[PDB]
């Protein structure tokens, strides 16, 4: 009851249109049957759509407008298309992603493989996307462009209690997008080799993003949050080459703790457009130079004075973090300049304590620009590893 398997469900008016040829069409017809059956606002339990291990083409965009809809598979089936595209495939035993593998072949007019949205009142709630694979197949024009105009899962209407777990996103310009997320949970996912990984736009409340593996694109974001409050970002392993790895714009009282960050460019952690009262602590932050040839020489347009961690806001606490910076003097922007680990761009009352810096070159562990006021820097470097352009800054040397 209320359980479908995409492979057994035939579209009554279109019999040879299978999950293999257009799983998008199949799922839309299943949702149509669900709405068929559950007409009572007091009797709309939802359903579960199971996606068996296999290769499926999605040409038709799926519009999800029923609450408590669960689309689940048996695996994330990640596979590095990046390495395939920059390697010699001869004799290779696998050329593509697996598990419950959905190949997103969407048209410009309907980018998103899955678009969750509904008008009217009750906001959509309890939708679960899990254990399956969304593959963008390839990048266009350049095979290493991270561009292709496709999106995996996009939530455009205010939603409550959404759950996104065990997924596999690969080669999508935008993997996951969620606007107006409330009590959202994104955990235990593998999102990589995407232009953008997770985008929490609009605004948000009490959202949790943990246990995830993410890697974005030079012109994209890894984790982006817009006007969020109560966001918890923890236990994630964010690796190479978003323009940033964690980027908050105007979020307040959020927390970024117990994470592993590795980037090849300036500004891996960004608190922009006045983020207030956030906690960034117990994270491992490592900045280094791009090591895979296909991408050598590419950047995010920022120089090393932007800072590995860029803060623009008030009362944020950046502490108990370990900074490992290894970058060739020759790749450092501007020539002759000392890399900045933590830049307090503007804002009042920011506090920077117990931040260990390890760098191959002379570096300013903390820089407080002339816009800042009443900043606090404790045990984050010797007096000559700290630059204060303000005069009310209180500094305490790491002995």
């Amino acid at each position: 009851p209320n359980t479908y398997d995409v492979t057994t469900w035939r579209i009554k008016a279109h019999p040879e249109v299978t999950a293999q040829s257009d799983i998008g069409a199949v799922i839309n017809d299943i949702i149509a049957d669900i709405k068929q059956r559950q007409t009572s606002p007091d009797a709309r339990p939802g359903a579960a759509i199971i996606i068996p291990p296999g290769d499926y083409d999605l040409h038709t965009q799926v519009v999800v407008d029923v609450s408590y809809l669960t689309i689940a598979g048996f695996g994330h089936g990640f596979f590095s298309r990046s390495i395939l595209d920059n390697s010699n495939p001869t004799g290779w035993q696998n050329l593509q992603p697996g598990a419950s593998h959905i190949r997103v072949l969407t048209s410009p007019s309907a980018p998103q493989a899955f678009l969750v949205k509904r008008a009217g009142d009750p906001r959509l709630s309890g939708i679960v996307f899990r254990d399956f694979c969304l593959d963008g197949v390839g990048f266009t024009p350049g095979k290493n462009s991270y561009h292709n105009g496709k999106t995996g899962i996009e939530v455009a209407s205010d939603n409550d209690s959404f759950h996104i777990t065990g997924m596999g996103f690969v080669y999508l310009e935008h993997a996951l997008i969620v606007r107006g997320a409330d009590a959202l949970r994104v955990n235990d996912n593998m999102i990589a080799e995407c232009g953008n990984c997770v985008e929490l736009t609009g605004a948000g409340q009490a959202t949790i993003v943990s246990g995830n593996h993410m890697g974005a694109g030079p012109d994209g974001v890894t984790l982006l949050a817009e006007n969020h409050e109560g966001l918890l970002v923890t236990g994630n392993n964010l690796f190479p080459r978003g323009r940033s790895l964690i980027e908050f714009t105007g979020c307040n009282r959020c927390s970024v703790t117990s994470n592993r960050l590795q980037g090849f460019y300036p500004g891996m952690l960004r608190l922009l457009n006045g983020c207030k009262e956030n906690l960034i602590t117990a994270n491992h932050i490592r900045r280094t130079n791009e090591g895979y040839p296909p991408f050598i020489g590419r950047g995010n347009g920022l120089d090393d004075l932007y800072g590995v961690v860029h803060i623009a806001g008030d009362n944020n606490l950046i502490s108990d973090n370990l900074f490992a910076y290894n970058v060739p003097p020759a790749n450092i922007a501007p020539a002759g300049a000392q890399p900045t680990q933590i830049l307090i761009a503007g804002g009042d009352a920011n506090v920077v304590a117990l931040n260990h810096v390890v760098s191959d070159v002379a570096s300013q562990h903390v820089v407080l620009d002339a816009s800042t006021t009443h900043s606090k820097v404790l045990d984050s470097g010797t007096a000559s590893q700290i630059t204060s352009y303000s005069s009310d800054t209180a500094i305490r040397p790491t002995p």
Copy 2:
């Protein structure tokens, strides 16, 4: 084998008593069939009971007395009954919780939808409750009373290695209760709009509570632990309006790290009745005033001198936490008083370091009561933001 679907299983002596009319009766008959079949202590594998997407009524309490029993659904199906009850339902497309939705309609004499217990020896082990929804339907007498005498899942016997994940608890006076929990794991659950969310009573060992979303009631607790040792509470997003968000009574050597806490009342984090050697660190603690009208004016009976964080015990380390306190002067109890962020009620050797406070009013960041001895306060406020009623307190100003 050993797999049942609640919708296909008929009760031999009672054929029209379905999962829809009394899933409680259905599951008890299934357990009776399991015991039927597995009579050998050396041959009791257990079984899995699957609950398909749907609306099911539970009138009969389920007594779970077999080890390794798995009851799973396809979704947590949370839905805010609170907002429905305080809104105008006209034209609303949903009026109820979804997914594998169980409506708890229990009688006073058997409160708990599920009661796990067994006499004799081997303690119950390996029981798993996952991916389904427990809904208390409503609150009684007042629609906003958070009272109804119903409980979702209750474990009354000593247990080992229990697993509670992906659940959805809503409108229950008591969502989950687990006595004598050992190696228990509560993770990735949505427990809200309940009088009480998670209650670990009796005593406990090496338990883990992480990745959860919890919201309780004014007269209830969000997360409560009794005489626990080795408890790890991490990566949880605890929001509004338990009387407390985290409450330990006499627990020793436990840890509360990387969490997001938001409360509307005094004492969100409580270490009572001599809790010893606990670590409270890397948490974002935000206290503010109740913002949803139906509940404006209700409290937990505590004043602002109780402290957002209340500690009564020895050798506890409260550090690297961010306190964001925004409360109207007029809502502050007692009139004229300065809100206390951290109150060290009694105890020896407590240590409070690197705790950033942000508040709209003059506040005492740390207060050491006259009962305290040998406390340590480092970088948690200026001398005038710190009150020590003891004389052996060692304090180091945030410069």
Copy 3:
């Protein structure tokens, strides 16, 4: 499609060889059917093998050589064989592990129940092992030897994006072994009463080990990592009696945060053979004496001067940790000696800040060996609780 249930699948050449008699043989015949069918490198989605609740004997080793293979059950079914073996079974209602219970009865020539490996190019990817149980049945010659030569799951070839979750490992000499792990994820598992729990050998990158429950053997490791970079170990509850609880040899830039550690011996946390730039923070570290008689009197061969936390490497940051040490003066090695909480064995630039120690005896909170250089000790003890055998050490007294 591509979904198998071990109990329904007959081995054409050997019909009475069932999952109950040799699930190993059964799974190998299923993999053979998968390779039978998916012969195209461009069409190798993989499959799912479901293991129903039950008791299954594994005599034949399973060789997993297909990408995106998912083997899942309905439970971890943990059960303490240790307590059974040291107790009086009379009237016991359970004498064995449950759920999807696989009894590993492997022969010396093929130790591993599951051996994942493949030659040729693409590295194996997306393999998922979840929600089932691997039981070694017993220890041999001594019932409490933690030796039996059996291994649960072993990955011998370079792998990518493997996922190991919801598992139950019990009484195995080696529970899980994964060489050349990359973007690996080990989370939400119960690995205990095993000689060794998790062994990440060879080398590794961006691996995550979180939400796990682990307990090893006196002669084994709980969590071991070899030449790993980007490892995140967070939210785990590691309990008694590995020789160590966390042991890194030559790992760089890894992070161990928000964990609960409990050991009965010296060196519960070890950074050996030059581990550089690692973060060890926000962990609860509790060292005490063995309390279960069968094992009283057995050690790990190390004395109390090895330190609960042993660091040999450069630029590591050990901070915001709570040390609870309770050990009988008489069990302390060498007689008269003061236990060492943190020992900086060798290395340059290590930093030790805000580490609270609680112990029943006089103890040296931090000891910097004569090999160390430029170490930093802040707020981790009074001057007499700190021993520096170097002269360039910078120390700041906990007031």
